[PDB]
């Protein structure tokens, strides 16, 4: 689990 | 450039074909060519531009992180000297990544942003500007790291001010902007509390506006809200 | 070429780094540079060369199939005329694929194969020659399709004759050669019965030699045998 | 399920 930006 | 002799409509057609074939470098070159025709982009065309470059820079960012990690493990105590190759190759990848970011930023500056009057286009382009400065910031070390960070922040802030005045809290562009600005705070600006506050506030204001949406719009907004929730779960 | 000023050992080091970063185009350019130094390749180096180009051409083959399918659906009755773009873009991809195959075949011809004396290297290179002619055959239409097919067949056949004389039936290179030659028969040469016979015979002779192997060699051989079984299950 | 070559 890591920080996500918009996909 | 090399796409100067092709029709604008043909470039767009080929961009869609390249997307289907997962040929993102081709897709990016076609969309660059379409931008350089000088006409404003439609909503569909803006999204093609974004998809193409996101996939190109995505590959480069992932490679850079692999190589940076190897490089860092080489600079531990007890590690064996293996020569300049790791640094050299990390620099090559880094240079190519900076070249792609510079290309996107050049297109936004010449002349997508200045011609963009409607809120949906202007926020879209200003968000992109923030994102590509953020990607440059991920690899910056020297005496320009601070100026790059401030350029990212400034682009994001201007986009946020417009989005708050002109768009509903559930608008996917507004939501994606807020998500990426929160990532900026958390990973680049060393401001985790600012990141958490923005993500929470964004989520709660969207939640309270969902009642106004159709079934299809509902699905679009809640997808992005879920990404805000995922980050919050990790950060807190 | 452009890798002329880099040390052979550095090129090999960087090829391994590029593999870890999944930068296969870079990996292929580094290995091309290493080949052009003029020294024979080790077993490890041969496998790097193969991995790099397999991944590059793999991407191009997959794109070509997407575009070819779209092109064919455009040439049905009831389909709307959309202009030359699909054909043009399929041709671009096709040309780039042929350029990669031509590059590999040029390296094998100058001068990897002629310098290759041991069975393990000679079979490896002759198998590669077969594979890259087969890739060219997948996209050939005109009056050279038949000559390309015969070049593939001839390379595979020479490799098979050496492998049968010089290697055990469980040898992974021998097994992979037989697998790919069977694919040639089935998909390119329109000889499904020949494909089935070769796959079965190869499987059965390996099965009877497994008793001679260590635990690690056993695992290597049975992996490839499983791929023969998968094809046979589909073809029969 | 499709024909596979060596991987
Ligand atoms: Ca025109
Ligand atoms: Ca040591
Ligand atoms: Ca640098
Ligand atoms: Ca305008
Ligand atoms: Ca030397
Ligand atoms: Ca019609
Ligand atoms: Ca052609
Ligand atoms: Ca020799
Ligand atoms: Cl390099
Ligand atoms: Cl084209």
Numbering used by the authors:
A (entry chain P), D (entry chain P): 1843 to 1849
B (entry chain A), C (entry chain A): -4 to 231
Task: Quote the passages of the study that discuss this structure, keeping the authors' original sentences.
These ‘central hub’ proteins hold a key role in cellular signaling networks, as they are known to interact with over 1200 protein clients, and are involved in pathways related to metabolism, apoptosis, cell signaling and tumor development. Protein interaction with 14-3-3 can yield a multitude of effects,8e.g., the structural stabilization of the client protein, the masking of functional sequences, or bringing two proteins together.
The model was used to screen 296 potential binding sites and to select eight peptide sequences for follow-up assays. Structural characterization via X-ray crystallography further substantiated our findings, revealing binding modes consistent with known 14-3-3-client interactions. This includes an ‘open’ binding mode, where peptides bend out of the 14-3-3 pocket, an ‘extended’ binding mode, in which peptides occupy the entire 14-3-3 pocket, and peptides featuring a disordered C-terminus. The identification of such structurally representative 14-3-3 binding motifs, without having provided such structural information to our models, testifies to the strength of our deep learning approach.
